[PDB]
């Protein structure tokens, strides 16, 4: 992968690999959101990046993911080839957001789409700060100045409020527990875990007759490696809607609610 | 990836991603055995499989592993290249043996190998069969005629017999199940995900202090997507430990094998 020529985005080519596919021989919605996290990292490490500031560094902040919202209209095959685009622009004190286009390397049209707010937070409290003035300076000039919206719409699902699921759930999967694989090179579970937990409480019979087309994740706590999660899930609706909550097992702690649709094939 | 010049072997070279990578920043032997399984498949894509003969699909046979044997010096960081080599050979009516060369693409010394144990079986009964004179004609002509060992040593590590665990197991980790992302494009668990229930019994004391050479495993029965498994390890000596995977329920053996571990 390398920088576009203004330098102000990230284009990375990706094939499709045989362990990355589902039952339909398409890539898993969590393959493509461990290919955006990939193309997200190159992309911080090619504008000069180890993925924190020299202030971030000093003051002991790190960037946390807030919420992803990912729409895919055609998932990759086994085999081929997929391009993805990243790009990063500030959204003033509140924190960063993180765009991404997925498109096909053959035929040039866009099969997916993805956006994501990160915030600022201090890596030994826990303590989500506001994004500082010097902080903004440092990482503005890799950003484009103008706004550059993957999902722009005058009334998008990206930034829609998520209720709480309710108990009874409709569906669910208890007893959760991540493994040395679901954690990453500094020991957190990774962001994509959750979204595969999330889908684990969705019917095998919905997985089998439906696509998924969009998923919106708000991400509130984060669940150690010794915790135990339940995954809860409710229809609320041609398409599927599902309403989805991530808890700790034991007192019930939120940890993660967000929104699925799913589409008949 | 592609085909050697003698059509007799294919390479592939990987760049380590971000994801992929352990505590030390280089990459899992999870994801090493996910390179290994990727390269084998390519493998068989580009000599004509569309992965079985056409006495395999006629018949109802698919070729299961029985047994995989990786051994690695250093393991590829975050970034890097790693050309991967692999190549078939007839082990005779009794099985197909599958090995790996793991090299670094900036240095071209070998930084790990692997070998493996293929069966055949009945998709359908999951009967264990033998291999038959037409289905070994098939794809011997994609094969070395001469023998071509990554593990040549006589009376080696790879081909060591691994006894049964006795309980109580030293350590274990209990209750785990596989999700969607555990399983294949054929809906059974994926060989890679064994190797990760395996080494969750290993304590995380020695995982950070020491670092993983060698591991054997043997695969006695699959697990299925509403199973669950126990993970029981014992030192039995670097670190030498001795595994076992199991059914929750009834106790039903599903995998053993060992692990060498080297301190840093
Ligand atoms: C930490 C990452 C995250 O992936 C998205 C938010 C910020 N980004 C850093 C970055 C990378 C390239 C250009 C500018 C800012
Ligand atoms: C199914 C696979 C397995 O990965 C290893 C054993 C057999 N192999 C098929 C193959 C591929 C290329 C050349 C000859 C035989």
């Given at each position: 992968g390398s920088l576009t020529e203004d330098g102000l985005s990230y284009k990375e080519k990706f094939v499709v690999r045989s362990?990355?596919?589902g039952s339909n021989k398409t890539a898993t919605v969590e393959t493509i959101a461990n290919l955006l996290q990939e193309v997200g990292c190159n992309h911080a490490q090619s504008v000069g990046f180890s993925a924190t500031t020299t202030t971030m560094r000093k003051l002991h902040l790190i960037w946390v993911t807030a919420r992803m919202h990912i729409e895919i209209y055609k998932y990759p095959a086994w085999g081929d080839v997929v391009e993805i685009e990243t790009w990063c622009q500030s959204e003033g004190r509140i924190g960063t957001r993180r765009d991404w286009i997925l498109k096909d390397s053959?035929?040039?049209?866009?099969t997916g789409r993805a956006t994501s707010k990160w915030v600022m937070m201090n890596q030994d409290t826990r303590r989500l700060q506001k994004v500082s003035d010097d902080v903004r300076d440092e990482y503005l000039?890799?950003?484009?100045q103008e706004p550059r919206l993957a999902f722009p719409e005058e009334n998008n699902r990206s930034l829609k409020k998520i209720p709480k699921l309710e108990d009874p759930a409709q569906y669910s999967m208890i007893g959760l527990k991540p493994r040395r694989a679901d954690l990453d090179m500094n020991q957190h579970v990774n962001n994509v875990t959750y979204i595969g937990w999330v889908l684990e409480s969705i019917p095998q019979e919905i997985v089998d007759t439906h696509e998924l087309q969009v998923i919106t994740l708000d991400y509130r706590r984060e669940c150690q490696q010794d915790d135990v999660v339940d995954s809860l899930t409710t229809t609320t609706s041609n398409d599927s809607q599902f309403l989805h909550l991530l808890r700790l097992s034991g007192d019930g702690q939120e940890i993660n609610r967000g929104t699925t649709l799913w589409r008949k094939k």
């Open positions: 362990y990355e596919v053959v035929t040039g049209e866009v000039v890799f950003c484009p």
